[PDB]
Write a protein that binds this ligand. Sequence first.
Ligand SMILES: Cc1ncccc1-c1nc2c(Cl)cccc2cc1[C@H](C)Nc1ncnc2[nH]cnc12
Length: 820
Amino acid sequence: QAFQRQLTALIGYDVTDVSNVHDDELEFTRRGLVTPRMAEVASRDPKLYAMHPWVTSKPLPEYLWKKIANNCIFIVIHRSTTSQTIKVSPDDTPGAILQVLRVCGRDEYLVGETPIKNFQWVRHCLKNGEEIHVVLDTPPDPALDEVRKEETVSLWDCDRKFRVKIRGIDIPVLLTVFVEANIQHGQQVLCQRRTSPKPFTEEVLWNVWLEFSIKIKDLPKGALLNLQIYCGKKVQLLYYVNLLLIDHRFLLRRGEYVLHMWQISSFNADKLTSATNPDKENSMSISILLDNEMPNQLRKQLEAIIATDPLNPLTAEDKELLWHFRYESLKHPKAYPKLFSSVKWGQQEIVAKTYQLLARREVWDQSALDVGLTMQLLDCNFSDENVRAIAVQKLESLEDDDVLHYLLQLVQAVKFEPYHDSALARFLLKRGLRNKRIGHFLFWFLRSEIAQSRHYQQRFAVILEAYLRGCGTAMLHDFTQQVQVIEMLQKVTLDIKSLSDVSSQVISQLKQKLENLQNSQLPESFRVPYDPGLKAGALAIEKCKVMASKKKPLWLEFKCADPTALSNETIGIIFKHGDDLRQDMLILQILRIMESIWETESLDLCLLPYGCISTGDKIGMIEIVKDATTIAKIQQSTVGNTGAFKDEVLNHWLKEKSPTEEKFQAAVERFVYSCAGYCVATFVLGIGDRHNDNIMITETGNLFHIDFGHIKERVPFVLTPDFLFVMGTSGKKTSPHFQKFQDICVKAYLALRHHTNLLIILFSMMLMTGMPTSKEDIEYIRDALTVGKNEEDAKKYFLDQIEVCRDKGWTVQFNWFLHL
Ligand SMILES: Cc1ncccc1-c1nc2c(Cl)cccc2cc1[C@H](C)Nc1ncnc2[nH]cnc12
């Protein structure tokens, strides 16, 4: 039982607790997840698990090939104080041809049957212009990863109409009010019934049967009884709660329920949860009782429909066509979301035909994996397990590198699962247990939601517990260490915040508190949650500070615990309270996806998606990007504390940080690319109009936006005169670098548009699961990606945007200044 107490603290929630359930679905899931855990445990190669090689099968891009010399990769190998360099061909395997080679300063290994060109660490060095420093080391013992040993009427024979008794609602404290009861499947309301309005007192009783038109034999599995409370005095939603009509054992839900409801403040994933509100003492409750072959024009119309984006709404006509031409639609994997949205789920014979249809998915099974298409099947529009499972079926072929690219949003998509035990939850379980890097991030992503989502903490806790019981003792200790450190640091972060430029007493107290944590509480070393390779050590109390800001975040710097670390660079972590860093995580992850897209078209845009992990309610950690300052500061340094800005200061800031001409122009080139990435990426994501104290530049030219979890003459993005002066453009001219900037944006924008469907789905999912949203909010990226339009035309559009900034110059940057 002591092991369970550890799990609870690691998880941040008590999975054995049953104080907020009305059935045993959670416990059933615990027991259900035992098998796929042990299958993965018993199957993983202990030695490859222990070393967790971070590897990709993608080609090395054109931008990384043209950085090689005569098919030669230099790899410095170390012993104790040995440093002997080797000539290696890209195709050389480490655990054979290089003769375990751990990376210097990192928990990262160049091992296994893949060439060195295909290790992400090696590609990381090639990109930045660094060298491959490895250390001959003993392999880490797989015994350390050891895992603690463990231990009657049919539904389709029931033509009776479904009914639910609304006994009444009850609220301790506090105009009229009524109950709406929807049978839902996906976001689709199948059947809706309301009560009569009554006066809104602390108790309202109806004692009324709501008889629905849908038959019990017609309720599809995963149908939700969605109970909602509205008020008049033109109504308004005030509370909601859901109840699965068919439970986890395929039994029709039967009997008395007192469901504690959620309060409002709309596609928001929280609306879909089957979790009841656990705050029984303040929350509105509701009491219920359940006691129960084609023509040519048609082909072209069908093809036009199949070709539209995931946010083009299907008409009744559209759906009827897809459904009638079911089998022709089944030949086109891109049709699948629309076809399955053309299914009348409230009709048992249609669902049966849909299931027949699903048994003929040769073309789907044979199709190359499209993540975009696959993600759409995992969104809120699909509640059927068999549809959703063909989505997860395709995810199974993702190599680990790609799982990590999509992990955050795969974890978020668990929120769209009807049941706690799902093919998706088990896929994430499986892939996390097969790979320590996936498992590490799975821990934190799951934990991020467990700590601040009442709506989904129970589900995620069960999944996280199931992961933890298979990750192996080493990772348990390891995770335990990390949680203890962030709890210590979050405490210091919050305490300093209460004590409010940063005054004398603040700078005094912080450093004492850091010195007090250092001397007793803090461990020898711990893993950096956002960069599991890096192990942090002792604080550099010297270098730690608090921002002259209203949120008063902590800038912390640590020593690297790893003696074999080559640099002297500290590990920098910002701890901040006040911002919802879930939104940042999501945006930063989409920026990583955008980078991998660009990579497929051999385009680098040098984005800087810095590490960020939400650890709790409005709280978390941000990776310190070293040698960087804000653009706003670069203007204040030369111009003044509070004044509007001059065009030359950024370029002449860049100049004064660049030592040689070789490294300066590099900075300017790096900046042209960087500026282009963020102009395209922020435009697409609709977060481009930012005050320049939320844009940053490195000493080596790399522009990057920060502080995403925030967001009248406007601007599509930020391409200010100071950015344009670095390119060399005095108001209305055209430099060589600017035409190249214009060049790069266009190719980047068109590159994103080639994955339009993927981006639309990730943007939709982002809004639904991390931004508490409307259809019109979601439909921004359609316009941003100029859906339906041609290359030439989308290119004009984007150039027109580049010029909108030019027309405005400084007006919005300055209009912020006044506001702020
Ligand atoms: C580094 C910096 N330069 C100029 C202006 C502000 C900052 C800065 N200072 C901070 C302090 Cl003193 C404490 C806590 C957080 C701070 C954040 C910043 C800047 C605004 N942001 C970042 N600075 C460095 N790395 C980052 N990664 C993500 N965001 C950043």
